[PDB]
Design a protein around this motif. Sequence first.
Motif, PDB file in Angstrom:
ATOM      1  N   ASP A 157     -35.008 -38.148  15.336  1.00 49.43           N
ATOM      2  CA  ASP A 157     -36.408 -38.375  15.675  1.00 49.43           C
ATOM      3  C   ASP A 157     -36.562 -39.021  17.046  1.00 49.43           C
ATOM      4  O   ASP A 157     -37.598 -38.848  17.699  1.00 49.43           O
ATOM      5  CB  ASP A 157     -37.072 -39.246  14.605  1.00 49.43           C
ATOM      6  N   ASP A 215     -29.947 -40.590   7.051  1.00 46.61           N
ATOM      7  CA  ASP A 215     -31.315 -40.090   7.061  1.00 46.61           C
ATOM      8  C   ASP A 215     -31.810 -39.957   5.629  1.00 46.61           C
ATOM      9  O   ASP A 215     -31.257 -39.147   4.869  1.00 46.61           O
ATOM     10  CB  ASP A 215     -31.390 -38.742   7.779  1.00 46.61           C
ATOM     11  N   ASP A 252     -34.187 -38.370   4.613  1.00 47.67           N
ATOM     12  CA  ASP A 252     -34.612 -36.988   4.429  1.00 47.67           C
ATOM     13  C   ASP A 252     -33.449 -36.111   3.984  1.00 47.67           C
ATOM     14  O   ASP A 252     -33.621 -35.224   3.139  1.00 47.67           O
ATOM     15  CB  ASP A 252     -35.223 -36.455   5.727  1.00 47.67           C
TER      16      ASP A 252
HETATM   17 MG   LIG Z   1     -37.726 -38.379   9.000  1.00 50.31          MG
END
Ligand SMILES: [Mg+2]
Lengths: 305, 319
Positions: free
Chosen positions: A77, B74, B76
């Motif tokens: 990100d 992560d 996710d």
């Molecule tokens: Mg994310």
Amino acid sequence: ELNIIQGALELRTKTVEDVMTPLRDCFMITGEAILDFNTMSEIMESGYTRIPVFEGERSNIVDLLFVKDLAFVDPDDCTPLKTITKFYNHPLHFVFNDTKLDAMLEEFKKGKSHLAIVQYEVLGIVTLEDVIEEIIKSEILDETDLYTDNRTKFSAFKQTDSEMKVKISPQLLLAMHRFLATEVEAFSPSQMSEKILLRLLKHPNVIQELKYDEKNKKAPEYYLYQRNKPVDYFVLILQGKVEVEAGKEGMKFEASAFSYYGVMALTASQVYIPDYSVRALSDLQFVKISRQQYQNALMLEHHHH
Amino acid sequence: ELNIIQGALELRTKTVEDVMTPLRDCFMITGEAILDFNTMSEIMESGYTRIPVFEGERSNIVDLLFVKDLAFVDPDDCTPLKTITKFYNHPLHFVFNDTKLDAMLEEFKKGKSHLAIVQFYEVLGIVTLEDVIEEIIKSEILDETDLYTDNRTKKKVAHRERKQDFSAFKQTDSEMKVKISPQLLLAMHRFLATEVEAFSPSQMSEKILLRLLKHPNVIQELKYDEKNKKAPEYYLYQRNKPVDYFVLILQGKVEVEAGKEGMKFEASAFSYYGVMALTASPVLLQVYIPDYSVRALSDLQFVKISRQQYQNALMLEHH
Ligand SMILES: [Mg+2]
Ligand SMILES: Nc1ncnc2c1ncn2[C@@H]1O[C@H](COP(=O)(O)OP(=O)(O)NP(=O)(O)O)[C@@H](O)[C@H]1O
Ligand SMILES: Nc1ncnc2c1ncn2[C@@H]1O[C@H](COP(=O)(O)OP(=O)(O)NP(=O)(O)O)[C@@H](O)[C@H]1O
Ligand SMILES: [Mg+2]
Ligand SMILES: [Mg+2]
Ligand SMILES: [Mg+2]
């Protein structure tokens, strides 16, 4: 056991400056910083739980950053540090240079931060562990911490792509390395050291991509494997979707990333003949290791003595 | 401060049990857990840097998770904890209850994991460096959640701040799509082409029906929360609530409560509902109002066609 008593009797005289860490030796991070993979790697390689965030000049310490804050951070990100500091907004713990270690410990006990700035000319920082290592008369360390405050002393995060044949995010490569070193014995640490495994993954033309074209959807160029056709290379999908036609009846199923094929091709089976076919349904981005390459990596690991 | 000067005399004789945390109240994590959002939120709400990892029974502590080992994880990705605990493989410091705090501090200062498991071996509990230090200095140290200093003292500090309702970090939770086998697609296709007249070849050629069924979002799934039952989001159809979408259950169970008297029966696969919702004839216009409530009893996979989509498909008239 007398050193602890000595330090105890001497804590009322010693001040923070006696155990202070000069500002020149502090590990800082600018508030105008982004948490891309490189900055996070630099943060972690220092092994410091608490890092002060400074705006402009280093003497201007504006916030705090805890490694525990980096839990839900995805280096992909490339989130900006400001957002993290705003979500957490750690409390600043300020102290003066003319302070006794007794008051310092009294503050840390119920203090909102075990790290405190010594000052308004800021000279450095003091942490609870410094106070207690001075009291106990013997230094401390959790080996994650780099060295014990005497300029004397793990895997370096050197998994960065610098304009090579194919581009992949460092976090993707890190996940690859972790998965292979863990869940595949061929690439296990016991058979091959992690450094060698990393060198092998970023070896030229090992990591490669492949574009999908409905015209040649079933062409021999998009088949990573063909049934009853010998091969010698190991595959590990990093991105994309593949169709595996397995068994003699040809049962078809689908597989995405982190699905590997043909480990036996690398080790001794001699020949490896896969009874399955792997076709590409989308843009693929994978690892391809040849038997020669795996053997060369084993040679490397056995050569270091 | 005089307690510090005698804490030494005490550390030469005391034992870990005098300041040990009891294995019953230790917050641990199962060996086979997944580091998805929910599990990471548990870990970070507990607010503990080191967490033992047990396989099967709590007494079989086999690994140790550090929060620092999550920096490059992560939520996710839903990374298994097994990979991390096997990759970092932090060593465990096993100790016996008859361990003078002197040698305990000696071991801790050496570098081995500060958290040590004190123990057919039997599990006694956990021992931390801050525990020995709180015993020596006879004071309270706290930056994690609980104020307990040495033994048996549940407490609350600063309104349990660590649990910060992290849900803002979450990903959108938007499923990329729904995977239906080609054979399930063909079975559904044929079943709709035959029994149901609305989708018959007389009104929709095979190609247009296949396009409508492959259309985005027509095929959907629905996860079943055994606790959050009878949620208004789990009612495919509500009784006497105007609707405009035709359903066809491909897999799962549903409870249908039909009739004004409200008789409830259980229907499973290929049991469709509300076919008249598709009709678009002149008459809040030409409303269809069902006489039944369809709720989910298990994970559902079904079709869901709006009146729009169906009338569009019929509008595709090309000779
Ligand atoms: Mg994310
Ligand atoms: N951010 C920092 N930069 C530089 N030195 C630091 C920093 N934080 C602590 N130190 C020094 O590191 C030594 C040990 O401190 P310590 O509190 O153990 O750090 P830490 O282990 O990373 N925090 P913790 O996770 O609680 O153990 C002391 O000499 C401190 O002054
Ligand atoms: N897994 C655990 N479950 C429950 N309580 C724990 C656990 N681990 C430690 N504790 C208790 O929590 C207290 C805090 O331990 P502590 O040494 O501060 O961990 P830590 O702060 O995360 N490491 P550090 O950063 O050096 O302070 C100790 O007194 C233990 O009794
Ligand atoms: Mg430390
Ligand atoms: Mg990601
Ligand atoms: Mg602590």
